[PDB]
Amino acid sequence: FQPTNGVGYQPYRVVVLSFELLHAPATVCGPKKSTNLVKNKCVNFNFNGLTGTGVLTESNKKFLPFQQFGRDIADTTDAVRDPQTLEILDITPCSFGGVSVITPGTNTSNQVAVLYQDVNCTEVNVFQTRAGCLIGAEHVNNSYECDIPIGAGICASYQTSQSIIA
Amino acid sequence: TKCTLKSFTVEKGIYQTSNFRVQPTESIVRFPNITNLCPFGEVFNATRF
Amino acid sequence: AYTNSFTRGVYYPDKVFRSSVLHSTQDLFLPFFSNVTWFHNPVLPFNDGVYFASTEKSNIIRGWIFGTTLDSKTQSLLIVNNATNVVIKVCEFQFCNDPFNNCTFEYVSFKNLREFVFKNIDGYFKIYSKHTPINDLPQGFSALEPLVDLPIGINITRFQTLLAAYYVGYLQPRTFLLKYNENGTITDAVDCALDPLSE
Ligand SMILES: *[C@@H]1O[C@H](CO)[C@@H](O)[C@H](O)[C@H]1NC(C)=O
Ligand SMILES: *[C@@H]1O[C@H](CO)[C@@H](O)[C@H](O)[C@H]1NC(C)=O
Ligand SMILES: *[C@@H]1O[C@H](CO)[C@@H](O)[C@H](O)[C@H]1NC(C)=O
Ligand SMILES: *[C@@H]1O[C@H](CO)[C@@H](O)[C@H](O)[C@H]1NC(C)=O
Ligand SMILES: *[C@@H]1O[C@H](CO)[C@@H](O)[C@H](O)[C@H]1NC(C)=O
Ligand SMILES: *[C@@H]1O[C@H](CO)[C@@H](O)[C@H](O)[C@H]1NC(C)=O
After folding, report:
1. Topology given in CATH for the domain delimited by C1-199
2. How many angstroms separate the alpha carbon of residue A101 from the centre of ligand 2?
3. Where is this region: Disordered (chain B)?
């Protein structure tokens, strides 16, 4: 070995990594991906082991120093301990529901008002009630007999130029 | 409403047609602080082979 | 000799947290009111688990020995507390017939009751524990919090003991009913096959 030969006789260092695999837990593994944390949005998470979709929010449950998950009476995931900073989050399924088209007689008018059931419609003139939130209906402080029942004591009707009142 | 009722006129009432569903914004992944990396700097950077 | 383990030997079977809810889980547990082979040294079998207990004063009980043939030509675990740290190996150190080499793992870090539990689930090691002060196995209830895990996959059938009193149980596949309190702590359990009232 001389430093002024050609490359042909010029020394080279060689390392041969022989990857062997048996029925083993196989701990020798590369780094996994890790994204930043976002709350209060219907996101599609995958914490350390488990996955799912929900709306992560900061919580106030107190896990035991070795526990990781949480579950309900019906065996559903409810809380996760964040593996990087150990703060417990909650998990709320981002909202869903049904769409219902209120109409007066078509004979009477072509105007309607929609009721999204059981949402806050802050992420979905615009009225929030106890049964959903009503879109396209005035609010009156009076009271009359029920014309079109809705739920939880709200009845809407068509009244005076005219419009729909609730 | 008309298309669900199979009618061109509908009498006064309340009817249910479709379904609401918020969609997932994005994905998120979390894992423990990756430390204790391989001492590959010990076999590649070694003194004597 | 023999004695009767009244109510002891319940370990959190998993990692979830449940608050004030009665749960029914099936796994390997020590049957209620069993016999424990009171001792005061020789090898023993490893049917499906153990309930090593002890009531020591000055750490007279040190460690353990595992393995199938318990010497060379087949691997064998080890655990010791040699006044420094819990040295763990899976080497084939010639096992002396009265104790007190090509290996593929390593690690280095009456008033006591060092209750322990050992399981070779999927051939890999699993340990629980609970270290309780006391002042001849007392009654009373206390759960076991897991503290270690070894991914070895060794084939274990027999074990031994190194060098007060200590006992030995054997886990069996029995269904229980666990009473998580509000904090998530196991507070009471009912054996689901002991007797008609329990059923
Ligand atoms: C209903 O429709 C008929 C014709 O289709 C019409 O003569 C009648 O006035 C309508 N009544 C109301 C209350 O709209
Ligand atoms: C709608 O959302 C806002 C912000 O998240 C919240 O402050 C408000 O209380 C919600 N509405 C209801 C009726 O809870
Ligand atoms: C187990 O315990 C019972 C009650 O203490 C005793 O009668 C019996 O001899 C013990 N051993 C066996 C093998 O049953
Ligand atoms: C493991 O090493 C020992 C000597 O330390 C040797 O006798 C044995 O053959 C080796 N095992 C294998 C599978 O090579
Ligand atoms: C251990 O031996 C049993 C039979 O005695 C066999 O079923 C099992 O696969 C063996 N495990 C290992 C890890 O060699
Ligand atoms: C629950 O945890 C709190 C927090 O330390 C503690 O003060 C309390 O004694 C524990 N047990 C109960 C039953 O509240």
Report:
1. Jelly Rolls (2.60.120)
2. 24
3. 21-37
